Amino acid sequence: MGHHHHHHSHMPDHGDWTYEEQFKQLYELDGDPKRKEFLDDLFSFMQKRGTPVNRIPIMAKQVLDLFMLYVLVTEKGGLVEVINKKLWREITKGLNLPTSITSAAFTLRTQYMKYLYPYECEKRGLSNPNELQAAIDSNRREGRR
């Protein structure tokens, strides 16, 4: 498995390639009706409020499965809840990601917040942007004395 020595960068992941392809891999993940519906409805929704998908973040050379990420986080109670539980270890493992990665919990927490958030608050009302900041700051204080 290997311990997290030093992240910074590696050989180009599949998300640093500038090509005019609509990220079809997300749809080709499952091939299920719910899969394409959520993804497309999401992209339109986030675009309307001025925050669409430019390029998708990569983890361990695989795509950050937006659909799967949203599923695991929402069933735990939403972004802020997951932050308050610090239980991101479950979120990574749910995407077949190695919890050994240095800032995995923080990286997912960032990318999710950017792309996957207005949907949980609008459709469900799970987390508010206000409680969110308090959650994050509480996570920040966990580092030094």
- Say if 6 falls within a structural domain: no
CATH number of the CATH domain containing 58? 1.10.150.60
Domain span holding position 49? 24-145
Cα(9)–Cα(50) distance, integer angstroms: 30
- Say if 115 falls within a structural domain: yes
Q: Coil, strand, or helix at residue 101?
A: coil
- Say if 2 falls within a structural domain: no
Written as one letter, the residue type at 40 is D
- Say if 1 falls within a structural domain: no
The DSSP-derived string for 58-89 is EETTEE--HHHHHHHHHHHT-HHHHHHHT-HH
- Say if 10 falls within a structural domain: no
Going from the C-alpha of 34 to that of each of 5, 27, 68, the distances in angstroms are: 39, 10, 11
Cα(143)–Cα(17) distance, integer angstroms: 34
Instruction: Identify the experimental approach.
Output: NMR
Cα(130)–Cα(103) distance, integer angstroms: 24
The DSSP-derived string for 15-31 is TS-------THHHHTT-
Our count of domains for the chain comes to 1
- Say if 8 falls within a structural domain: no
- Say if 83 falls within a structural domain: yes
- Say if 11 falls within a structural domain: no
